[PDB]
């Protein structure tokens, strides 16, 4: 029976290695089948749960395997996935679209890319916050959308930077970086050169020039 324990250990190690390699941790799975035959037609109903890093999911679907003499065609006739109720509404509407399309692989790929970009955004915010406690006001949180950069001595001048993650109709994921300026008028009548109205385009050129963190570091040093 010791050898049997050896196979159990080997299988557990292989499962852990594969799960950490792909990034999907799969929980229990249940299959219930019903044979509805007229050329043979077989139907299966599946149920499995799991999670991917922060995100957790549980989904139920069924496939119709139309066996015949020369082809084995199986189509996912019905899909149904349910999400934990977070505020991430864009993920929910992507869930709705994928449910309408009835595609399973695309859902997993898009979920991976989404959570991956989310992890980058959160870690970048946390790192730049811990770098400069004195010039960063993380109003809503590191795992949230926007950022606030302000001076402690004076709250009049402040610029807000927004980081958003968007899922396209086709399925691919892409972020976008913009900013807004909370500026009192007194500064506007103060300086005549007045290039802050061009701030969006110039900021985007700067961030595309040499990177994201570099541009933010330069801006925060300039503000200080």
């Amino acid at each position: 029976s010791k050898d049997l324990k050896n196979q159990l250990g080997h299988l557990e190690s292989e499962l852990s290695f594969l799960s950490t390699l792909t990034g999907i941790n799969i929980r229990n799975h249940s299959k219930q089948t019903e044979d509805l035959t007229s050329i043979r037609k077989v139907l299966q109903r599946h149920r499995l749960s799991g999670n991917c890093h922060m995100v957790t999911f549980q989904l139920e679907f069924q496939i119709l395997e139309i066996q015949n003499k020369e082809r084995l065609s199986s189509a996912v006739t019905d899909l149904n996935i349910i999400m934990e109720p977070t505020e991430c509404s864009e993920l929910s509407e992507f869930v709705s679209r994928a449910e309408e399309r009835k595609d399973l692989f695309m859902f997993f790929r898009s979920l991976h890319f989404f959570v991956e970009w989310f992890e980058y955004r959160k870690r970048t915010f946390k790192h730049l916050k811990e770098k400069y406690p004195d010039a960063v006001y993380l109003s809503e949180g590191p795992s949230s959308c926007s950022m606030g950069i302000r001076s402690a001595s004076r709250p009049g001048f402040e610029l807000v930077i927004v980081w958003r993650i968007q899922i396209d109709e086709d399925g691919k994921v892409f972020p976008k970086l913009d900013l807004l300026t909370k500026v009192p008028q007194r500064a506007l009548e103060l300086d005549k050169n007045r290039a802050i109205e061009t701030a969006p385009l110039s900021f985007r050129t700067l961030v595309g020039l040499l990177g994201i963190e570099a541009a933010l570091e330069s801006l925060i040093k300039s503000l200080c």
Partner: peptide
């Protein structure tokens, strides 16, 4: 970044 390589290959094949 081997997993990103795998996912890129998955996209190209799908």
């Amino acid at each position: 970044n081997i997993q990103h390589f795998l996912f890129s290959l998955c996209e190209y094949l799908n």
